[PDB]
Design a protein around this nucleic acid. Structure first.
Lengths: 128, 171, 810
RNA sequence: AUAUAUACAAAAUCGAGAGGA
């Protein structure tokens, strides 16, 4: 019933706040900071590990401010939080790749408007 | 996808924890209970960020325990059908490619791998390749893939992938 | 069904199984192989653990289809003295590797050619097609070539392309190639500079400073002309770090000057203490990889997988050396700029591409060496089991037992042939023990069994052997290992063969069978990969690759089974032994069961060896492969001589002085030295055609005694063996100074403490401080358990000093 | 240079009558 491509979600992920893999990243090492210190605490689960490594492997922005800026930039334009996160996580190159990856951007914007959007992403994309 | 959502829980507090430092105990029990688990309604529960409200703790008549209802926020990772995410192959079989989209495990049946690719077990690292090897997926490679189907198993989500359409696969 | 053609084709079974099927050679392909096999299978590894020979062998393997045993036992002169059986197995192992490489090198050849076409249609490939691909001596450098290509030409496939991660292509969008070219010194060249460790190619200055060139290229993805410098450096970096030549030198550098640092993770500081395996390297610093010992890195890496420890491989500087190249001298101040950019480009290359990838490469190399050691050890251990001769068929009696507290002893008399004859159960006390002893002697009198063997489970084997000794004197008695028998018992087959018996009788039959001929029993009870792996060949066995490990173990079996050879008839008439035939070279599980089949079906015994192709349908190549190795107690069949040498052997028989001739020779060698090796060899230049001297030397040997067994003769275990067997832990596992939980029993002047290991623990009188002084109760109450530290061992009596003083405990 | 055990709740319903406080 739930369909990302058709932009369908169950009611719980309507007021949900999305993230970018780099947001999740920085928060997960934040929690590593909490865990490594504060002894007499349970070690983080292998699930926590798998997600940590993954988001680390694909966090396209390695600076907090840059992530914030990315976000903010995606906010000011009418976009769904879902597409917000998919664009920022996937970092597509050309407008047509975006459509292939995020069909829910079908007809929403113009390919050129979108293109300079993507370009704005990429230009904020931090070196690492 | 990763999200940040608000949730519900009631903890029973044994009377040994009445005393100073008892709300910490309500915390620490929320931590030790909710985190690390996976539920199909919400998907992988990565961690709990910030609680909101500790309710009024009702002594249960007889039996001692106090029941505190709690409000809290947590990170969750919930795939959805028709989504495209990056994934890392961990191992390659003639059936398909086992990948993980983070904590979740995903699989791409041979049929879902395009037709050009063939599976080559004979390779020094086993891999799926084209005859000319212009594109080669093997261990540790990152790929994009459409989550075409997901399934619940023991509160554990695993996805079903596809590399059909344009701009998927080997990154 | 695959099994049908395999049973039916004319190649040895184990040839069809292999993933890369075996295709003939060319003798130029073969020479290049042999060179490769030499260099790679005989170059020093990174942790401390003729080509014509390889040529000849590969020829045998790949063109004639001789299996490694036939090469090894019937083409010695070709490959000896420089290849042995294990060497040939290694050679065929690496021939697979060669072929994989050849096939990937081919694939890449085509891919490159296609790209050349496409480029002609429209940088380019000129020699790198030649220079690189043809000169790929290793899969590693093949990936360099391959990834190198994919950087530049990978963009163009003629579905959509699936944009890359590394954002090189974002730069390549905005002509950032312009800058990269304009940094001096194209990456090929730089790699050359490294390769020679001195500035073979000078750089190219420019009439500007970086920024001005940047204004040209600063557009859209990169405004702010510094951002285009960043892109340019990054471009330069990947290009450097993908360049194969850079990779070669830097891969080497890592090989030679690689240090290993280790620290413990939160989880590790706590749980790594003095008995955890990792204790010796919980903290390492600048351990050079050249010093990693045999399996040490396997442990290190396991300990990292357990997360309790964290590691890294590096060189420390190298960067400093390197930067001296891509550099210029004059102080113009418009070159200190370019030099500075140049430098930090190389930083990025090394710091986030090459160092990392080289570290993973090396880790895998090391780790895999370690693995190999472990496999090697497991193989060596099995070699040792299998290389022990039968005792001096024989009626063996085998006694097994258990904890024995309310559990009886069964013994099994196993015939010479190996079939169990009869069994006996042997369950205030002193009279009970006495009655048992009496009935034992009754059994032993009645049915005189040559050898009485007693399991090893614990100290009780000692008393058990000594009682039996006490009996027999009034014909040998031997302690015997019990590890395989445990496996037999637990296995479903033992149920199969003895539905009625209790399990410990199943050990009894086993332990008798193994003493009679260990190879047969191992082969019978190690029937499947799971089974063999149940045995404990090495502590780390569990971590090495199942496939590789099974391979080594099965090859060990193959080796010995061929030396021992297999009598088909007995494997018929006593279906116990059927397992062997699998390992006879030329045969296999499929081919073997087939042969046993036809023989069963026809209800005939192999009267001869030529009866094989004659009466069964086995093709020429397999008969050549195997036939050597099938005893048939036509007299030459029961001898290691091959059927292709029967004529030479008969000739030698005549030259001794032909049924009278042979039987006389068999009755005695009238003149061993009747022969002249040189003379037979000389003739063989025109009759037999080869330097078959050693073959003759063997045939003479074989005429001496038909199938002389080459196993080593049995020896009862050295007391070290007894110790590590009954106690079941190793010279390593008694770490003198280990800490151990022991139980105190009773001051016999001492403090007699029983170890869980079945070991007596004698806290010495010095710590005790009471010989004629009051008993030491005040130090400790009798009855309970304490944990103390070893300070001496008495293996020959199973006693170990211990320690009271927490000073010793610290 | 020694030292023997371990299984689990069995017993119903209806009707009548006689009593007890």
């Amino acid at each position: 019933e739930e369909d990302a491509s058709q932009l369908i979600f169950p009611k719980e992920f309507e007021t949900a706040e999305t993230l970018l893999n780099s947001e999740v990243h920085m928060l997960l090492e934040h929690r590593k900071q909490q865990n490594e210190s504060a002894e007499d605490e349970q070690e983080l689960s292998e699930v926590f590990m798998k997600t940590l490594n993954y988001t680390a492997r694909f966090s396209r922005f390695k600076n907090r401010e840059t992530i914030a800026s990315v976000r903010s930039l995606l906010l000011q334009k009418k976009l769904h939080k879902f597409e917000l996160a998919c664009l920022a996580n996937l970092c597509p190159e050309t407008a047509e790749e975006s459509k292939a990856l995020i069909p829910s951007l079908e007809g929403r914007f113009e390919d050129e408007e979108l293109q300079q959007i993507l370009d704005d992403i990429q230009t904020k994309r931090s070196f690492q | 996808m990763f999200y940040h959502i608000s949730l519900e829980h009631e903890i029973l507090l044994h009377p040994r924890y009445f005393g100073p430092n008892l709300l910490n105990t309500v915390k620490q029990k929320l931590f030790t209970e909710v985190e690390g688990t996976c539920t199909g309604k919400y998907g992988f529960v990565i961690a709990v960020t910030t609680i909101d409200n500790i309710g009024a703790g009702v002594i249960q008549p007889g039996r001692g325990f106090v029941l505190y209802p709690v409000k809290y926020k947590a990170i969750v990772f919930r795939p959805f059908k028709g989504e495209v995410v990056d994934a890392v192959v961990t191992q390659v079989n003639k059936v398909g490619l086992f990948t993980e989209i983070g904590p979740m495990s995903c699989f791409i049946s041979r049929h879902s791998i395009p037709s050009e690719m063939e599976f080559d077990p004979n390779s020094n690292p086993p891999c799926y390749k084209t005859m000319d090897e212009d594109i080669v997926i093997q261990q540790d490679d990152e790929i994009r893939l459409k989550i075409v189907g997901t399934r619940v198993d023991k509160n554990d989500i695993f996805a079903i992938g596809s590399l059909m359409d344009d701009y998927l696969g080997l990154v | 069904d695959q099994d049908n053609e395999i049973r039916a084709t004319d190649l040895p079974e184990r040839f069809q199984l292999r993933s890369i099927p075996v295709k003939g050679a060319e003798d130029d392909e073969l020479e290049e192989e042999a060179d490769w096999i030499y260099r790679n299978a005989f170059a020093t590894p990174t942790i401390s653990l003729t080509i014509q020979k390889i040529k000849e062998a590969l020829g045998f393997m790949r063109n004639q289809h001789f299996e490694v045993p036939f090469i090894a036992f019937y083409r010695k002169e070709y490959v000896e003295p420089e290849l042995h059986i294990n060497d040939l197995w290694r050679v065929w192992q690496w021939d697979e590797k060669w072929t994989q490489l050849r096939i990937r090198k081919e694939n890449l050849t085509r891919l490159f050619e296609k790209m050349q076409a496409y480029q002609y249609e429209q940088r380019a490939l000129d020699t790198t097609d030649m220079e690189r691909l043809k000169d790929v001596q290793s899969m590693d450098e093949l990936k360099d070539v391959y990834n190198h290509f994919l950087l530049y030409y990978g963009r163009d496939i003629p579905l959509k392309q699936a944009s890359r991660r590394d954002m090189y292509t974002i730069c390549q969008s905005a002509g950032l190639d312009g800058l990269a070219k304009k940094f001096g010194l194209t990456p090929e060249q730089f790699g050359e500079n490294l390769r020679d460790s001195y500035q073979r190619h000078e750089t190219e200055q420019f009439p500007a400073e970086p920024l001005e060139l940047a204004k040209d290229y600063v557009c859209s993805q990169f405004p702010t002309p510094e951002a285009v410098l960043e892109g340019a450096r990054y471009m330069v970096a990947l290009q450097i770090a993908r360049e194969p030549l850079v990779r070669q030198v830097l891969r080497q550098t890592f090989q030679e000057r690689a240090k290993l640092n280790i620290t413990p993770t939160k989880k590790g500081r706590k749980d790594v203490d003095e008995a955890h395996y990792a204790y010796s390297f919980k903290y390492l610093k600048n351990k050079p990889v050249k010093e990693l010992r045999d399996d040490q890195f396997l442990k290190i890496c396991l300990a990292e997988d357990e997360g309790l420890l964290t590691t890294d491989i590096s060189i420390d500087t190298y960067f400093e050396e390197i930067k001296q190249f891509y550099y210029r001298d004059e102080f113009s101040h418009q070159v200190q700029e370019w030099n500075r950019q140049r430098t930090m480009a190389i930083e990025r290359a090394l710091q986030q591409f090459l160092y990392v990838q080289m570290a993973k490469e090396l880790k895998n190399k090391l780790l895999a060496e370690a693995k190999e050691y472990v496999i090697k050890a497991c193989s060596r251990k099995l070699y040792n089991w299998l290389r022990v001769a039968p005792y001096r068929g024989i009626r063996v009696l085998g006694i097994a037992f258990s904890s024995a507290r309310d559990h009886p002893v069964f013994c099994a008399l196993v015939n010479g042939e190996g079939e169990v004859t009869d069994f006996l159960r042997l369950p205030e006390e002193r009279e009970k023990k006495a009655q048992d002893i009496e009935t034992l002697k009754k059994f032993l009198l009645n049915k005189k069994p040559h050898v009485v063997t007693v399991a090893g489970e614990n100290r009780d084997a000692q008393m058990l052997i000594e009682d039996v000794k006490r009996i027999v004197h009034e014909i040998g008695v031997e302690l015997v290992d019990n590890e395989l028998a445990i496996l037999y018992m637990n296995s479903k087959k033992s149920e199969a063969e003895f539905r009625d018996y209790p399990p410990v009788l199943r050990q009894a039959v086993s332990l008798a069978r193994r003493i009679q001929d260990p190879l047969i029993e191992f082969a019978q009870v190690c029937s499947s990969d799971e089974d063999i792996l149940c045995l404990k060949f090495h502590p780390l066995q569990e971590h090495v690759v199942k496939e590789e490990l099974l391979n080594a173990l099965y090859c060990e079996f193959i080796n010995r089974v061929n030396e021992v050879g297999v009598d088909v008839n007995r494997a018929i008439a006593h279906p116990y032994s059927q397992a062997l035939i699998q390992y006879v070279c030329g045969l296999g599980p499929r081919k073997g069961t087939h042969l046993l089949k036809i023989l069963k079906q026809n209800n005939t015994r192999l009267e001869s060896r030529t009866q094989l192709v004659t009466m069964c349908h086995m093709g020429p190549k397999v008969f050549m492969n195997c036939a050597g190795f099938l005893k048939i107690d036509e007299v030459l069949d029961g001898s290691r001589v091959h059927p292709e040498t029967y004529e030479w052997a008969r000739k030698m028989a005549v030259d001794a002085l032909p049924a009278g001739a042979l039987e006389e020779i068999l009755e005695n060698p009238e003149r061993l030295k009747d022969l002249d090796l040189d003379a037979f060899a000389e003739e063989l230049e025109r009759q037999g055609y080869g330097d078959k001297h050693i073959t003759l030397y063997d045939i003479r040997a074989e005429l001496s005694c038909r199938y002389k067994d080459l196993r080593t003769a049995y020896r009862s275990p050295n007391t070290e063996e007894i110790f590590n067997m009954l106690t079941k832990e190793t010279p390593e596992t008694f770490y003198i100074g280990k800490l151990i939980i022991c139980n105190v029993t009773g001051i016999a002047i001492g403090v007699k403490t029983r170890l869980d290991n079945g070991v007596t623990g004698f806290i010495p009188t010095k710590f005790l401080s009471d010989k004629v002084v009051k008993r030491p109760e005040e130090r400790v109450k009798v009855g309970m358990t304490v944990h103390c530290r070893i300070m001496k061992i008495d293996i020959e009596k199973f006693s170990a000093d211990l320690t009271c003083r927490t000073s010793d405990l610290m």
